[PDB]
Structures are given as structure tokens and as C-alpha cells.
Structure 1
């Protein structure tokens, strides 16, 4: 009926939480979003991996009168929210181009007459065949954009069909909007807001730390043996192993099977009833292990293995973010080889030059720098999302075996002072040439040869300077700007090192 369930909205949220979704307390972020959403103020909600984002629009939808529309690109999961929501008495529905015309009209007719409270619609469907015009007669009280980084060319998963979502604000000037995402760095967060035309929204950015996940890496070397010994050492704990090919999945699954490990294969070339069996056997812990391509929200996954490295940190974060959703101790292990990053680079550098290849090259490079990190793996991930932190976690493979340290105060001011001195406009190599005092026309053309930093670092190698700055980006003192061609930029945390007010310990850069 689209009828508000409670009389007092304030105490309504937590009423519903407990009485309708059975939970006991709100997860930080959650109340503030929900109260803001009931108030009618636009929002951008950035909740970490499996942090509880759907509740943020489901609870307000249950407490308001009218139709809440939820847009999502994940057809075949949207359907599965519908059914569980219907299970719990919640009057949900979805509407995509994958339905039959008869079935789409029936969902239109329940929105028309207010038998549907919550409507999950694919982006493409929402802008086609004058849907907005019909949507305007159904008392629409709230539009939620899920997966909202998908509208940005700067994120890791731009989808062209979300583009047209920038028309809705204009069409629906009193319609409150919320934009939800679990994966979007600063640029992308900023872009989401601009493109959807969020009106002075509350921007709530939860933390990205999952502290119960330990991040590890293993340098490949007879990797199949390494992958079998790794699994063995898990001593029965549940897991997902990610591979980039259907034959890697299929073959690994068979080898595990052959050693008495209850392991199955998952990928697109399985039949819809077979995937769902796989998923369900995994959900209940009938299977220890699922070997898969990039396609289950199980709360108790103990380990996530990446056999091949992802093309970006965003993907690496969502994929490892599947382990340990119950909050108990879990682990992510990435098997890496520097040749694997030379492949991807080769692959990428003969795709059509331009804007898109750049966005892709910056994101690959930052994935590549995480893998070759000499700094806490958790700090790399948080400072990549803009959650600037300098305290090592103590629960990742670099922190379990720290690299030899040296006082880097002098190295860091040199590097921090060059970046500021060149007006924060230049990428890593140019800066490093200025630090080393190369004989470069470009340098002479900009007069950087005249600077006092020019050549202060000549006695150390290009790789030394590369590591220093990479350690500064990993620690949150320096960002690489993706919208300015990866220009090295200074953050507030640089201030005390840059002033000489505080010392800084860095790893002695590795000889490679």
C-alpha cells in the first residue's frame, strides 16, 4: 500500500531493524543515514565491503508512504532480494528487460495501485519507453542508486546505461535521492555526487578497514604446488579461490577434488540450476571450497585466494571483502609474480590510446604498486580510498616481517618538497628526474633545473626515489591524482615531515 509502518519515525528505524530484519543494533553509519533519509535529505553512503548498505534504503522505505525505487545493475541478485524481502512480508518487486512484457506490466500495475512498496529496476529499464512518465504517477517518495560508482568514468566499473540516470534529478526536482557504494575512492565519490546531482547531500564515508581480514602475498614459484600447499595448510577452513580462466577454475577444482578436498567449480558456463546448487552447498558448508571466476554472500568464508592479480584495487577489495563477513578472523592471499604485471601492461598498452587507457593504466599501476609494496598492506588499501592513516595494522604479511628501516626524514622532505615545488602537476618519473637532476629539456623548459631540489637525490638510484615516493603514497602523505594524469599531490599528513617537525622511518628500498 506504500503505507508508513510506524507512528514515530525516529524510534521507528530501530523498531523495524529488530522487528522486521531481526538485528539487535545498528552498524555505525546506518542510523545517521536512515534518519537523514527519513528527513528528506539527499545522501551519499560509502559503506565498506558487506557493511550493511541495503538496510539504509530498505528501512526508510518501510517507514514512508510512497514508492521507493532502487536502481541496480545486478539483475540475478535483485530478484533474490525481492524474494527474501517478500519472505519477510516486505512488498518488493523488480522490473528489468529480462522479464516478459506481461510480467513487466504486472509490476507496473502494482506500483500504479500501491500494492508495491519497493521496486528494484535495471538502469536501462528506468529510462526506456517513457518509464519516468508512468513513474511520476505512482507516488515516488525515494530513489536509491545502488552500485553508484558505476556512473563514473573514474571508477573501476563504468556502465554506460547509468549515464542516463543524470536525467532524473532534472525530471524529479523534489525527489530525494540516495547514492550507495562500497567501492569508490575520492575522485569517484566526488564524481558520483556531481553526476547524480545530489543536493547538498550528507556524505557519510564508513571506514574501509575490515580488521579481521589479514592481507598476505606469496611470490609465485611452482604456483600450483604453492596453491595446493596453501589450501592444505588451511586445514579444512572454508574458502574461495579466484582464477581468471574457466580452465584454471575447472582444473584447480579437479586437482583439489583428487586430494579429498570438497571443492567445486563456479563460472558463467554452468547452468542456472548448477550455480545455485554450488552456491547453496557453499552457503551451508557442504563444500569447503569454491573455485571461481569473478562471479555468494556467505558470512563465514575463511579465506579468499587470488591466483591471478586483479586489474585494480577496487576489484581486489570487493573480492577479498567476501571473506570474514561474520567478523571472525579471515585471510586473503594473493599469489603474485612481477611477470604477471608485465603481461597485463603489455595487454593494456595496445588497447586504443586515450582517456580510458589512462584511467586503466593508473589503476593497474596502483594495483602493481600494492603488490610490490614495502609498506603495510592495509595502509595501501585505506590511503587508496582516501582514509588517510599512518599506523601499521600488525595483521598483514609486511607487518609480520617488516622490511629493514632507516630514518627517511631527509629523503621524504626532498620528495615532498619537489612535488610541492613543481606545483603538484607531475607524475612519478618527472619528479624522480628532477630529484636526480637529469639533463632533460622538459625540465629546462619549465625551469625546474633552477630549483634547489634539482639533483639533491642524484647519489641514490631511480629505484630508491621510486620506493620513497611510493612509501609516501602508501602512507597517505602523497596522493596520485587520476583526474590530472596521476600527478603527485600533497595531503595534510605531509605537513610535519615537510616542516622537519617529525621524523619518518621508511623501508630501505629493495634492489630490483
Structure 2
């Protein structure tokens, strides 16, 4: 039955019914199923394994790297009535030995365990002789070279599905990169599992991106015209831009404070309180709570879509209207691409950072609703334009390349989703390269159907289709038509570029 969940739901959490897709989620893991759960961070996401752990006999085994964070998940839980504990190598050998006893005696509802502890051959043996309700892999993205913090530990969690096939696995993440969603499925065998996407949308936050032009001038005009005495956060890239901006703001009568990794650990706690407890304070920070936050300003490009979402997301936590306002230019993209180039990072990190940036730039350049593009990155599809973003409200002039997008998508399909942008372009142009003649492509009916345009436009159309996920690359430069391709091909969706 589904309703014992509800009795525990509000006898413990205090919510009268599930939110969005969580009812579906809790039922699937409680009836012994597997699951892929993608949600913004929050105690609603924790509900998805904590509640099933209460519903099924035995202990939920929660895998997480945040061992520093850990000790207040049990503290939170041990006053609701729930029994939970921590197992990791920060512990003394007697203490480690008594959580184990407690585990073996069916005394815990939840066991939080660092990957380091879990993957030890000894630890996996205890589990075999302990009453286990499930495995929850939190922050599942870590298995991936792509999505966030890779960890060498995390891609060994292969083993849960091996040594414990019969026990349910639910993997939950807040960073749902599309290459990363795919890689989690592979490590924890959830290819065959349902994948659940709860909404990332924050409807009350209006999204704006625009061109940098005297950014300190632009900002002040924004703050006075639209958020005169309200609490806001202004993010800057460097510790020096925080300092100087913070006192530039003070100079114009705005109660601004600096907040960075740098100076004193007392002021930092001091700055938090002034923000947390007073009204109309603006904090300037690099990367690093208040229910009352009316805007988030970006005066430089964030490092990623993940970061941008978490940062803008600190706004409007009281459900009321808030603005996310960002300007970038010129030099911001150049400065970034130069650092990627002079970075001493490993090959895959250079590969990840380049698509991170491509993703972000693609969002910055949206010719249609920004929100749709943003939410798509996290695997959420918003059917209709939102009506609360600068693109929606002030539509830019667009070039329609829908017809060309269709030609391109068919071209890659009748050639088997394997040739590269340049080759496809040859076919489109009706050029009898020898690579072409070798595959017979010279008299497919699609050959030269694109002779109308030159080489430069097609490569452009192709990047655009790649960036928006109508094509998928990482075949090694071969382009595959994705499922999303039906949109342009059959369901009337349009490909629009900014007129620029």
C-alpha cells in the first residue's frame, strides 16, 4: 500500500502530501525498484531515500562524500525520531565498531557512509550479514569524468549492483548534465531504471542576460531603478573585484559588504549575520542564505551552468518576485578561453571546461526563451515559453534557419549518424570529395540539396544544432541525430539564431 508513506510523511516531515514527482519516486524505491532522481538540493530530495528507508525493513545505506557536512544530517534526523549514524575513517576504532554493531542489530534506519569506508572488502561483507533496506547513492554525478567533481572512489560503486543485485539502488543528483546523466546510468546499472526529473524551475525568478557596458554603471542603474533598498547578492570573478565593487557601492550610499575566501573568519561570520538579520544589505562575493533576496547580479561569467543556477537560485526563496541580472562582454569570453588554454589541467578536464563554457554561452545567446534553455541543461523540458525572461519579454530579431536545420538533420540521418561536420557539409553542398565517393554519398537523393549556402553557414547551423542537442557529437566528431531531432523534423519546432 501507498498510504503508509503519507502517515510517515507528516508524522515526521510535516508536509501533508508529496510534491511534484516525489510520490512516484518514493513508491518505486519502496516496492523494491531502482531509480534515477534529479532534483535541486533540499530536504525534499533527501525524502526520496529517507522515507523509503523507513518504509522498507532494515537500514538505508546512503553513500555520500560530504563527511564534513554529514554530522548534521543525523543531528537533524535524530530528533524527528529517526535513528541514523555515520561510518567513516575520521572515526576511532571503538566508535566504528559500535556503529557496526548497531547496524548489525537492526538498530539504524539510516547509515551514512563515506565511499572510502563502503568499498572496503570488509565493509561489503558486513552488509551481506546486516538488514539492509536499500542503497542511496547521493551526488551520483561524481562517477562521471563530466558532470562535477569526479572521484576515483565513485566509479567503483559499480560494485553495489554486483554484490547486491536484489537490493534497490536509488541515485540522486542536482547536476544533471546530459553526458553525466548517461554515465550514472552506466556505473550503477540504471539504464533500465526509471529516471525522475523534479522541477528545477524557479518561476518567481526572472532571468536576464545582456551585454556588458560600464558594468558598475549598468548595475547601479539596475539597483536604483528596480531594487532600490532591497537585499541582493552581486557576484564577481576575482577577490579584487569584490573589494573594489563593494566600496564603490558604499560610495554611492548602498550598504555593500565584501565576502570572499580571503580576509578574517570572524568578519565572514559577521557578514553573514548582517546579511541574514538586517534588511536592505547587499553582499559582494566570488562563489559562496536569506529568504528575503530580491536580486542576484552577475558582473562576470560564472564558471558553469551548474554554478549559475545555484547562484541565481539564492534569490527569491520567499516565493516573491526576484531578478537574476547578468552582463558579460567581449573580454570576458576571451579571458576565459585564454585561461583554459594556459591551464595545466588534464585532458578530460580541458574537455569538460570547454563544453561547460559552450553550454553557458549557448544559454547566454538564446534566441528563444532563456528559461527553456536553462532547464533543458538539467534534463527538464518546459513545453511553452515562460513569459518571465528578458528574451520572452523583449524578443530579439531572429534569423529563421529551420529549413536548413531540417536539411542538416536529414543529411546526418541518411548517412547513418557517424560522419563529421565537414563531411556532412560536403554532402549538403554537393561536393564530390573522395571521402564522399568512397561512401557513395554522391548520389543519395540528398546530395547537394544545400548548394544554396556556402561552407560557413552549414558549419554554423551544425554547431547550433549540436549546442542545442539536436545533434550529439562525442562520437569522435561524428554527429548523431538525437531524439530531440523530431522537434524540428516532425513537430514544427524552429531553429532561430540572433540576427547579430
For residue 496 of structure 2, the aligned residue among 479, 499, 506 is 506
CA distance in structure 1 between the aligned counterparts of 2:374 and 2:321, rounded to whole angstroms: 18
Normalising by structure 2, report the TM-score.
0.84
Matching residue of 1:3: none
The DSSP-based 3-state class of the residue aligned with 1:20 is helix
The DSSP-based 3-state class of the residue aligned with 1:201 is coil
CA distance in structure 1 between the aligned counterparts of 2:465 and 2:310, rounded to whole angstroms: 24
Matching residue of 2:450: 456
User: CA separation of 1:479/1:304 partners in 2, compared to 1, >3 Å: closer, same or farther?
Assistant: farther
CA distance in structure 2 between the aligned counterparts of 1:254 and 1:108, rounded to whole angstroms: 54
1:164-243 alignment to 2 at 5 Å?
164-198=156-190, 200-232=192-224, 233-243=226-236
Q: 1:19 offset after TM fit, Å?
A: 2.2
CA distance in structure 2 between the aligned counterparts of 1:188 and 1:335, rounded to whole angstroms: 28
1:34-113 alignment to 2 at 5 Å?
34-48=26-40, 50=42, 52-98=44-90, 104-105=96-97, 107-113=99-105
For residue 385 of structure 2, the aligned residue among 378, 384, 392 is 392
For residue 307 of structure 1, the aligned residue among 299, 302, 305 is 299
Matching residue of 1:403: 396
For residue 294 of structure 1, the aligned residue among 287, 301, 308 is 287
Could you give the per-residue CA deviations for residues 315-352 of structure 1, whole angstroms, max 9, x where no partner exists? 33333333334443333223212332223223224546
Q: 1:177 offset after TM fit, Å?
A: 1.4
Q: 1:217 offset after TM fit, Å?
A: 0.8
How many residue pairs match? The answer is 497
Q: Indicate the RMSD between aligned Cα atoms, in angstroms.
A: 3.6
Q: 1:58 offset after TM fit, Å?
A: 1.8
User: CA separation of 1:344/1:178 partners in 2, compared to 1, >3 Å: closer, same or farther?
Assistant: same
Could you give the per-residue CA deviations for residues 149-201 of structure 1, whole angstroms, max 9, x where no partner exists? 11112323322221222222223233221100122133322321220134843
Matching residue of 1:415: 408
CA distance in structure 1 between the aligned counterparts of 2:112 and 2:6, rounded to whole angstroms: 24
Matching residue of 1:373: 366
Matching residue of 2:330: 338
Contact 1:299–1:326 (8 Å) recurs in 2: yes
1:213-292 alignment to 2 at 5 Å?
213-232=205-224, 233-269=226-262, 278-279=271-272, 282-284=275-277, 288-292=281-285
User: CA separation of 1:406/1:372 partners in 2, compared to 1, >3 Å: closer, same or farther?
Assistant: closer
Matching residue of 1:424: 417
Contact 2:471–2:481 (8 Å) recurs in 1: yes
CA distance in structure 2 between the aligned counterparts of 1:185 and 1:213, rounded to whole angstroms: 22
Contact 2:397–2:499 (8 Å) recurs in 1: no
CA distance in structure 2 between the aligned counterparts of 1:143 and 1:344, rounded to whole angstroms: 40
Matching residue of 2:481: 490
1:466-485 alignment to 2 at 5 Å?
468-469=461-462, 472=465, 478-481=470-473, 483-485=474-476
Contact 1:448–1:454 (8 Å) recurs in 2: no
User: CA separation of 1:118/1:417 partners in 2, compared to 1, >3 Å: closer, same or farther?
Assistant: same
Normalising by structure 1, report the TM-score.
0.82
For residue 347 of structure 1, the aligned residue among 335, 339, 347 is 339
CA distance in structure 2 between the aligned counterparts of 1:230 and 1:375, rounded to whole angstroms: 23
The DSSP-based 3-state class of the residue aligned with 2:2 is helix
Q: 1:146 offset after TM fit, Å?
A: 0.9
User: CA separation of 1:164/1:398 partners in 2, compared to 1, >3 Å: closer, same or farther?
Assistant: same
CA distance in structure 2 between the aligned counterparts of 1:194 and 1:211, rounded to whole angstroms: 33
CA distance in structure 1 between the aligned counterparts of 2:482 and 2:283, rounded to whole angstroms: 41
CA distance in structure 2 between the aligned counterparts of 1:338 and 1:455, rounded to whole angstroms: 36
The DSSP-based 3-state class of the residue aligned with 2:152 is coil
The DSSP-based 3-state class of the residue aligned with 1:130 is helix
CA distance in structure 2 between the aligned counterparts of 1:323 and 1:443, rounded to whole angstroms: 53
The DSSP-based 3-state class of the residue aligned with 1:403 is coil
Contact 1:417–1:453 (8 Å) recurs in 2: no
